[PDB]
Design a protein around this ligand. Structure first.
Ligand SMILES: CCCc1sc(-c2ccc(OC)c(OCCO)c2)nc1CSc1nc(N)cc(N)n1
Ligand SMILES: CCCc1sc(-c2ccc(OC)c(OCCO)c2)nc1CSc1nc(N)cc(N)n1
Ligand SMILES: O=c1ccn([C@@H]2O[C@H](COP(=O)(O)OP(=O)(O)O)[C@@H](O)[C@H]2O)c(=O)[nH]1
Ligand SMILES: O=c1ccn([C@@H]2O[C@H](COP(=O)(O)OP(=O)(O)O)[C@@H](O)[C@H]2O)c(=O)[nH]1
Lengths: 230, 231
């Protein structure tokens, strides 16, 4: 009964920003932030922190392990949020900061294509993904995708603005690549997924090139109309 | 009503041989071969497993964690499948698992980590994942008992020569030796800590299988039926 909406977009595009905004605006709207974001006390933070640093230094060694733990943490986190909150809500919405589909068809895919995962790992991961989402992940099924579309330069600049030590070393080239896989999934609908229902999930796309922190009403007005057509 | 019983033992201790003898005594009795045994010679799984298997042999410190997660997923999937697929009609169903998810973690994944083939982060992520999932199933795969085929590492070493697999012909004696202690500790001395609540009180049948039993197995089988009636 809770409506499940993935916010999707490139690194430093503004999702944490958009989703922080939205949640304040109705007691029937809650967010599930992205595990990876929290990694940059708990054993998951601890595990998260190490594997992310590991990943930065040697991605062709750590990428399969990193993608495995990121997806798992997300599945877990979305469940915690779902089976917990919003049970007394009139019009409940959970906004996910990315989805298990980003995990795979953006990030993991890019790492296969860029040779930081070899073929065995990628098909091991794909097998792990196809089946972890079917055993325990079926209640996570999205009612909508919201795509926060923004330039690779926007993001580099926005990376700088946030000032995460490790991210400043991230270059335009990767952002371009990551920028490139989103468009193919969310705009053209070029992507065959192993999850057919995604063929029918309605998408909304939102231009976040312009700063929106003092000026998001048109942005939130667009979401509001989306939600009532789902 | 399905009873789930795990058959545990070192490399070449006699698990499959025994299980194949057990499957034939009872229309009521079924078996789940362990998948790394099947890769230990094909589907998409069998493709990945042969590949990941050979890579583990080539360089364990790089592939342990990858091998471990995939072996256990592949085990859990075939074991969920039997419970849903096998033995539907039978009046007293018993499913014999060739090894278990506890042997994945507390014998093999633990030992690779002790042998420094997985780091703390590889180990703690493995364990986290092993729980989340093996708490998700709430009693479905949980064991009713266990049968430990007991051999000396020395018997085990011979048996690999008989079995004849090229790619297994260098497993050294000391490798078989650490796994022995892990079995011995876990299932005979019962000194191994595990995080699984019911498993401290899981009944355990120890059979010495050092003597060739291919053509002389009746007495073993009597302990199994004997053991099975207590459940
Ligand atoms: C946001 C920090 C996560 C990182 S770190 C990283 C990285 C760092 C350094 C790299 O080069 C040395 C690198 O190159 C990839 C090599 O092909 C990737 N990529 C990533 C993106 S992969 C990813 N997968 C997810 N599933 C989720 C998520 N947020 N990110
Ligand atoms: C017998 C084929 C499976 C293999 S291969 C292997 C191995 C191979 C080469 C190695 O280095 C040369 C190796 O070194 C570990 C040294 O401490 C282990 N260990 C194993 C046992 S780990 C295992 N984990 C499971 N979960 C299941 C299972 N049957 N085996
Ligand atoms: O319209 C915007 C959206 C975001 N930001 C800034 O861009 C950086 C990255 O934003 P966010 O943390 O939302 O990135 P994401 O969650 O997409 O990785 C942050 O320091 C924000 O303060 C901004 O200046 N204008
Ligand atoms: O009583 C026995 C038991 C086993 N074996 C042989 O020893 C090898 C090891 O058996 P198996 O593969 O069943 O052991 P597992 O690894 O399954 O425990 C095989 O070639 C068996 O044919 C034997 O000669 N006599």
């Amino acid at each position: 009964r809770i409506k499940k909406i993935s916010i999707e977009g490139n690194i430093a595009a503004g999702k944490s920003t958009f989703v922080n905004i939205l949640k304040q605006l109705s007691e029937d709207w809650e967010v599930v932030p992205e595990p990876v974001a929290r990694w940059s006390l708990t054993m998951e933070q601890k595990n998260g922190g190490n594997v992310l640093q590991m990943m930065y230094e040697k991605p062709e060694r750590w990428s399969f392990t990193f993608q495995t733990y990121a997806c798992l943490s997300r599945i877990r986190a979305q469940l915690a949020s779902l089976n917990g909150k919003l049970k007394d809500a009139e019009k409940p919405v959970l906004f996910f900061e990315r989805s298990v589909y980003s995990d795979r068809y953006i990030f993991a895919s890019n790492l296969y294509e860029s040779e930081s995962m070899n073929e065995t790992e990628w098909t091991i991961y794909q097998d792990w993904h196809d089946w972890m989402n079917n055993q325990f992940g079926q209640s996570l099924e999205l009612d909508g995708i919201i795509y926060l579309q923004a330039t690779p330069e926007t993001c580099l600049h926005r990376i700088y603005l946030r000032g995460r030590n490790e991210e400043q070393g991230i270059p335009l080239e990767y952002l371009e690549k990551l920028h490139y896989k989103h468009e193919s999934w969310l705009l053209h609908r070029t992507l065959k997924t192993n999850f057919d229902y995604l063929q029918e999930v309605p998408i909304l796309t939102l231009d976040v090139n312009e700063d929106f922190k003092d000026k998001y009403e048109s942005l939130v007005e667009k979401v509001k109309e989306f939600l009532s057509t789902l």
